[PDB]
Amino acid sequence: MQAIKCVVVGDGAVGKTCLLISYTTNAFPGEYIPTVFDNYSANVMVDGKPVNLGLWDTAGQEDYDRLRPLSYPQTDVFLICFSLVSPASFENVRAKWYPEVRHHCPNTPIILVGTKLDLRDDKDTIEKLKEKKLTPITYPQGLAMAKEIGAVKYLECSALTQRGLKTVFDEAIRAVL
Amino acid sequence: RKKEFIMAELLQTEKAYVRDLHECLETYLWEMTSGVEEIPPGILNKEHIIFGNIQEIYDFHNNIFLKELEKYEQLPEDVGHCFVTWADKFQMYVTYCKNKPDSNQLILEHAGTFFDEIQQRHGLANSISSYLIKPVQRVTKYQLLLKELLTCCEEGKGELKDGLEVMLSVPKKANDAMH
Numbered sequence A: 001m002q003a004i005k006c007v008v009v010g011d012g013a014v015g016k017t018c019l020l021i022s023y024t025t026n027a028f029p030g031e032y033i034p035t036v037f038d039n040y041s042a043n044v045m046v047d048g049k050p051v052n053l054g055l056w057d058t059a060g061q062e063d064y065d066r067l068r069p070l071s072y073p074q075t076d077v078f079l080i081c082f083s084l085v086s087p088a089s090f091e092n093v094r095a096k097w098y099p100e101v102r103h104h105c106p107n108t109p110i111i112l113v114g115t116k117l118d119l120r121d122d123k124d125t126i127e128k129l130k131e132k133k134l135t136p137i138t139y140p141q142g143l144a145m146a147k148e149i150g151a152v153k154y155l156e157c158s159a160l161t162q163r164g165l166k167t168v169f170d171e172a173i174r175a176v177l
Numbered sequence B: 001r002k003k004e005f006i007m008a009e010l011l012q013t014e015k016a017y018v019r020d021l022h023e024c025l026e027t028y029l030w031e032m033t034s035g036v037e038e039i040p041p042g043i044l045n046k047e048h049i050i051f052g053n054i055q056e057i058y059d060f061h062n063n064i065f066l067k068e069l070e071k072y073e074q075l076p077e078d079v080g081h082c083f084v085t086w087a088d089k090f091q092m093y094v095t096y097c098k099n100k101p102d103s104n105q106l107i108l109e110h111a112g113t114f115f116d117e118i119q120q121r122h123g124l125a126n127s128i129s130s131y132l133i134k135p136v137q138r139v140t141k142y143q144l145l146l147k148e149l150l151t152c153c154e155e156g157k158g159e160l161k162d163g164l165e166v167m168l169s170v171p172k173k174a175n176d177a178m179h
């Protein structure tokens, strides 16, 4: 039965750990956001044919440029993530994440994932950005970045509401089948 | 309330880390050192390259560090000092990290499905690769937990500052030791 190593990369601001916890528990953790997600695997049926999905977090490695790639070899698919309400995290897809992923894994499928979809339409979030002469990242910005990096898909999700969340991981699997 | 959740995760994840290393040593490593199974000539007497100093890291966490973290359970604002007391021990993560590339290539080029065979046989959700990344994961996670404590502990919190310093210094020194 097909096994899949999926590695989740991107800035601390994306909420990598929270994304994975909310996906695997089926709920935003709300009460306390745990800092630790240990390597996970579970059986999921996609397009009928069941699959063993493996999920590695990379949270904590954001400042260790030579430790991060220790996770990269033999990865089947990458989620390159930015927060839809952090322009900096979105630029880092281009500056930081895609390069090191290409350098180490030139032929591995990438899904471009926008997290914190629930905050893109949030008054306080929008306002706090406006004060720094910024706006949230909109859909065509995702599309344009996906194309530029050779992402197979651009997807937007919220861990909080679960909107688009299951879809992210379905598509990661489909990108390998 | 937050300081108690963080300390709980710290101890709980430490237990799981010790369980995971133990599982790694008594399946994947044991099958190589045992003399129970045919070892590919590609990896024979090279268990040292594959597992690096992970035995010694497990001995640290299993003999000392988990026992000492337990002692700080009701003293989360002081736990930084646990990392200061035991700073020298964490230098073995530098050694471990240096060796991880060589470990991974050796397993790729020369082990075929030796370890895949043991995984199926023992019923493990985690590959040898999953187990051997865990020390790299753990050594970059302590700094996150200490930073979380710094957001919810008073200025009786230089007994976090100096711990965080250590646990920023170790992964940086590990990172800087790579090719």
Ligand SMILES: Cc1cc(NC(=O)NCC[C@](O)(c2ccc(C)o2)C(F)(F)F)no1
Pocket: A014, A015, A016, A018, A019, A030, A115, A116, A117, A118, A119, A157, A158, A159, A160
């Ligand atoms: C990954 C990832 C995370 C995410 N969305 C969120 O974290 N949204 C919530 C952020 C927030 O702090 C929070 C946490 C809990 C609750 C209700 O609110 C705020 F108050 F602003 F709503 N989407 O993807």
